[PDB]
Design a protein around this motif. Sequence first.
Motif, PDB file in Angstrom:
ATOM      1  N   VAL A   5      37.447  73.837  42.968  1.00  0.00           N
ATOM      2  CA  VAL A   5      38.530  74.591  42.351  1.00  0.00           C
ATOM      3  C   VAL A   5      37.930  75.546  41.329  1.00  0.00           C
ATOM      4  CG1 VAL A   5      40.608  74.466  40.939  1.00  0.00           C
ATOM      5  CG2 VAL A   5      40.215  72.765  42.730  1.00  0.00           C
ATOM      6  N   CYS A   6      38.274  76.827  41.443  1.00  0.00           N
ATOM      7  CA  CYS A   6      37.750  77.826  40.523  1.00  0.00           C
ATOM      8  C   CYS A   6      38.211  77.538  39.101  1.00  0.00           C
ATOM      9  CB  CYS A   6      38.203  79.222  40.946  1.00  0.00           C
ATOM     10  SG  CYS A   6      37.373  80.568  40.071  1.00  0.00           S
ATOM     11  N   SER A   7      37.323  77.788  38.140  1.00  0.00           N
ATOM     12  CA  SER A   7      37.640  77.572  36.737  1.00  0.00           C
ATOM     13  C   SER A   7      38.435  78.716  36.121  1.00  0.00           C
ATOM     14  CB  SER A   7      36.352  77.363  35.938  1.00  0.00           C
ATOM     15  OG  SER A   7      35.822  76.068  36.161  1.00  0.00           O
ATOM     16  N   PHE A  31      33.061  78.896  40.050  1.00  0.00           N
ATOM     17  CA  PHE A  31      33.564  80.249  40.232  1.00  0.00           C
ATOM     18  C   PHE A  31      33.667  80.551  41.718  1.00  0.00           C
ATOM     19  CE2 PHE A  31      31.517  80.802  35.976  1.00  0.00           C
ATOM     20  CZ  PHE A  31      32.688  81.014  35.281  1.00  0.00           C
ATOM     21  N   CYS A  32      34.855  80.972  42.153  1.00  0.00           N
ATOM     22  CA  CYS A  32      35.088  81.277  43.558  1.00  0.00           C
ATOM     23  C   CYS A  32      34.599  82.661  43.955  1.00  0.00           C
ATOM     24  CB  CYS A  32      36.580  81.162  43.882  1.00  0.00           C
ATOM     25  SG  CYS A  32      37.575  82.553  43.304  1.00  0.00           S
ATOM     26  N   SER A  33      34.294  83.532  42.999  1.00  0.00           N
ATOM     27  CA  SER A  33      33.834  84.868  43.345  1.00  0.00           C
ATOM     28  C   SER A  33      33.253  85.546  42.113  1.00  0.00           C
ATOM     29  CB  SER A  33      34.970  85.711  43.933  1.00  0.00           C
ATOM     30  OG  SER A  33      36.020  85.873  42.998  1.00  0.00           O
ATOM     31  N   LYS A  35      34.157  88.346  41.015  1.00  0.00           N
ATOM     32  CA  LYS A  35      35.275  88.848  40.223  1.00  0.00           C
ATOM     33  C   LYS A  35      35.685  87.835  39.161  1.00  0.00           C
ATOM     34  CE  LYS A  35      40.027  90.450  41.025  1.00  0.00           C
ATOM     35  NZ  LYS A  35      41.256  90.163  41.815  1.00  0.00           N
ATOM     36  N   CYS A  36      35.930  86.592  39.579  1.00  0.00           N
ATOM     37  CA  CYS A  36      36.350  85.563  38.634  1.00  0.00           C
ATOM     38  C   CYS A  36      35.267  85.293  37.600  1.00  0.00           C
ATOM     39  CB  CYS A  36      36.707  84.279  39.381  1.00  0.00           C
ATOM     40  SG  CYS A  36      38.403  84.232  40.002  1.00  0.00           S
ATOM     41  N   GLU A  37      34.011  85.186  38.038  1.00  0.00           N
ATOM     42  CA  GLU A  37      32.932  84.902  37.095  1.00  0.00           C
ATOM     43  C   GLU A  37      32.812  86.007  36.051  1.00  0.00           C
ATOM     44  OE1 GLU A  37      29.047  84.549  38.936  1.00  0.00           O
ATOM     45  OE2 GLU A  37      28.185  84.058  36.979  1.00  0.00           O
TER      46      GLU A  37
HETATM   47 ZN   LIG Z   1      38.533  82.241  41.202  1.00  0.00          ZN
END
Ligand SMILES: [Zn+2]
Lengths: 63, 363, 140
Positions: A5-7, A31-33, A35-37
Amino acid sequence: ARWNVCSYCGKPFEPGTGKMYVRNDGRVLFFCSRKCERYYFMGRNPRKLKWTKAYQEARLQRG
Amino acid sequence: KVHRPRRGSLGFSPRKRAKSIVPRIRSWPKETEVRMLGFAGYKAGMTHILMIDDEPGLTNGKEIFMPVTIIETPPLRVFGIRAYRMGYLGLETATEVIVPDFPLDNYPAKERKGKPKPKMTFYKLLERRIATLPKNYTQEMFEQKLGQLEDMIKEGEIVDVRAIVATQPWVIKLKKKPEVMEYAIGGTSVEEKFNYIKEKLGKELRVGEVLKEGELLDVIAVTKGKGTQGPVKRWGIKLRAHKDSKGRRKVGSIGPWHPARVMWTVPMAGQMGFHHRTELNKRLIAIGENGKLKLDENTEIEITPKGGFPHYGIVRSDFMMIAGSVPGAIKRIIRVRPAIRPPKKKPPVQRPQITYVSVESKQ
Amino acid sequence: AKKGAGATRGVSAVRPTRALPVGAYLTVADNSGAKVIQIIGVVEYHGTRRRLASAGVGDMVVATVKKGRPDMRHQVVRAVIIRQRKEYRRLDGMRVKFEDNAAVIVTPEGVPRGTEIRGPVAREAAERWVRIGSIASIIV
RNA sequence: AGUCGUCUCGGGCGAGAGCCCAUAUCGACCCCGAGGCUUGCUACCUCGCUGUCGGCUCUUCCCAUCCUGGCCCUGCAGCAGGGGCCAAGGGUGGGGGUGUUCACCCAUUAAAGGGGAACGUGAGCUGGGUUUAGACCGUCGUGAGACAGGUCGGAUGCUAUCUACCGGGGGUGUUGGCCGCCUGAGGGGAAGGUGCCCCUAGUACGAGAGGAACAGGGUGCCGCGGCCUCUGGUCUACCGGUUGUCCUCCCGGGCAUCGCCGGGCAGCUACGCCGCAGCCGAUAAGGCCUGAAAGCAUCUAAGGCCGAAGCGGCCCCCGAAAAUAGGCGGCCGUCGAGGGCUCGGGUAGAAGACCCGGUUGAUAGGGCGGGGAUGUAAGCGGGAAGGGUCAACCGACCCGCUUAGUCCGCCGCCCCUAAUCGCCCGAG
RNA sequence: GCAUGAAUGGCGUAACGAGGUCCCCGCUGUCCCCGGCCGGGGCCCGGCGAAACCUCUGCCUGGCGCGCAUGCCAGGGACC
RNA sequence: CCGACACAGGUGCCCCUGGGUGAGAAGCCUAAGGCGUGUCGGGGGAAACCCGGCCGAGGGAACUCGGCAAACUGGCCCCGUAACUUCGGGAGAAGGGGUGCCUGCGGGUGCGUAACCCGCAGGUCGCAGUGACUAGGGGGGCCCGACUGUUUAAUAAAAA
RNA sequence: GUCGAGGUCCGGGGCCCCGAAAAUGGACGGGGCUCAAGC
Ligand SMILES: [Zn+2]
């Protein structure tokens, strides 16, 4: 074969994708990507973007 | 002076455009069992899976990531038998017999406004590849030709026999012009090979019937084209000094004073990609039926990712899931044969334990 | 089975990327008296023309102490990298990263010269070197 | 270029050193040679012009072999050493001072070998050294000045005529033409090379310390050929924020590197991922069998067996112009099979060429749907730090309609539109 | 002190310098190791349209030769 | 006009310059005025390669004769500034903090709530407020020449 | 001390053998040649 699960956006992502970032204190963030990171490290507030799970929590907080 | 390996390999020269977009197989493996030695398909796309490793190595019994490639494999049509005798300097074809025209049923006809169904037939799609087919060719003529070939085999002038097969892109709705290929048959006795081809002449072959899951194969195809590429990309030379005022992506010296000529080994620009290549020891992870993969006898999943394969349609027929990547752009015709030089400790010939299959949007 | 328990080294199924070339500054993450080191070589590695040796996580490198106590400065030492900033893939296919380029000073045979390590230690390095994981506090 | 005095490298004899023992190793005093890789000598070609040292880039060759393969002697217990033989398939790397080649030094490594190619390579690069014109110091000269003595600065021209190699095309010929599938004479390859780890084994060996090998497993590095599912770069398609200014203000736009900034799918990429045979045949060095010359002995004279990372094949790539210029099935000819231009498109591409489709239709456009990229549009209602007659009214910004809006070089269904008309070559 | 030296001046010197020279932090595609993108050329088509240069010609290995030959000698190869 | 030319040089930058941002005759946008003649056009994932420009993960000079080239800093306000010294300097040494928009208050000169400046409080948005443009990187040693200045028009700008 | 046909040395002559390693692939002019196509 487990969906982490992305944080940042709080959503799950499929196995074999994403990344895990380790803090110097031992705290681990998924982090799922990029972008999110990048948004997480830049400091953009997740609670103002509708495409995140934290937005629903913020809406509940503000009523 | 400072030594180093030369830039690029001389074992793939000349680096020219492939002679034919349809790959050719030069050598075949030696197998006791009587079966067709390979298959053909169309490259669809790529995905990944998580599987429990059964191949020998450090990562044995542990779940691992694994990239896989999808080849759509509509059934092939076996429509010819060819015989080879021993010539002075090698094999020479002695005779070849094709089946007479028969109606085509697997054609996906569509009813447009006006006119009836096209009512297609064999020898009508094949004309797009041959353009000169027999006329007034009847069952009796075909039978007598087959009898003549069998009598030749009995006499013993025939040392080999092979099958002429055709692809069927129309069933999967890719295109209509078929690709004709010549395949060797495993075994030892020409009589057994002839019977095996004869019983299937004019019929269909399925990769499920031909190949085995979990076996090693060799993949033959024409690689993606890159056009004209300079030596830096073609052979991997090092960029010249940044202070150069005459360019950076070129070879410095193309030879000494003597010999007073340019040696063929000096890297130079030219065609890159679109070469005939063979990749060895690629494992066949799975074979799926009608675009669906069965996991645990009660779960089946469409192999097509959400939104379809990029630059490709939807997998609707049988298909092959192989480990790793394969040469060729999307929709390229890919030939596969049994492992020609396999290792000694081979993986077990059976589907591995797949714990997860990725069907998420790949675009 | 020679040196069943006295073995200092092990094997890991994951090979991290070699993201640290010669000349990189690594932060010392133990109490050996050194604070910063500079990579000057990589053991068990063959290069090619004009190629700088590179090291990842769990591989021994030769370095010199730039900042540290007077006893330790200007000394050639062996260091095992335990954290790198360049993400590397694991068996399941996921990438793992860290916050800094951190290493621990060890003897040439792999016995650490310190008593404690500050911060997480990569599972790859811990598996490759038994002693480092044994004396590490938190392994991630 | 000739010669080899010198240089590098071999050989003959054996005084002597090696506890005895000349030859395990070193080998005086003498003598006979090989190479043209140091320097020199000569002045044979080149002064109506052949641009120098060093470095970078790139190609190739020799063995007098540093490592990698296999062996013999040993003053070879093992681990290691000294000397020698076959062997050139592969490797022989990174840095500090110095213009340096070289030499010295540092950390790794199996090793970090010496050389030839106009002291390879400036119509490929750089110009640090050298060798003009400016200038300073030391020394010599009365002086102008000089110094194979230091020191700072000091330009590198090109539209390829022939051939050469790299790829791409049009013809003729191959005893009539055409479409398709094959064979493989030949050429290319390193498509592979090399470390470490676990067991054998703390075993053989050895007083002890120390310490192997055959076989069996794992994996790294260098090299090669592919791919974009995953991760990273880019992504002047696309979405959003925002600064100055202009279109009168609101929406919406132009310019300011794409104005700047963050994210970014397809595509390309590597820093990412997948693949790369040890088997057979004959041999070199070397180990043996039978056997005489020379009634014995003897690996050799005749004969036979085994025996190398080296040689030939299996394997990969090009390959009917392979001049014995190939084989087979089919169609056509003695008007006419098979093609070209034109047409809608990239599984392709510098022009050519190649590939799909062409009403026998989903090739492109359009419509709808799917899947994605940004990040919640305009408009309206409410609130808002405060101001205002503490009214009306203004207000950066926030909240709801709103996973919104915009876009999509990706996918599916639907013949709604355009793939039409037409022209040309062609064996007899 | 091979072969420094006091007005062809000796020594020192703040400020100044597109003068020569060494080191440290920071920065970065200089480099490891190169990969994408933008505009202009390059490429094709329609036009205007030259020049440098030019004995004739133009494949190689080993040799002879004024001693480093596309043309000579013996061999190899090659359709335009 | 001169240079053989409808020459990117020289002569003539010889006399003059509305609005916005801004200290500015800077950079950028724009009004008047001028031009599309710094004169061959068309095509294209139509390449390799060359020249100009933008970005680039991890490391940060390991490149090179030499950090050549590029990058970092950059405007304004406040605090705070070393060795040395010819006491004038070094000095913007070095180093640190802030910077937008909106709602109002207070101060200077002023008859004026005209015009130009200087402060205070609160609210608020973004990764970034000198958001574009404009816009120094720094420090420590040694040799030479004191400094500003002049020089081989066309390879030497230097210690001469 | 038993077999029972020639031995054991020396100085020479002819041919041949070892001593004998190089850089683009290749030189008896070439093919090739063994009671010769060598001497
Ligand atoms: Zn994410």
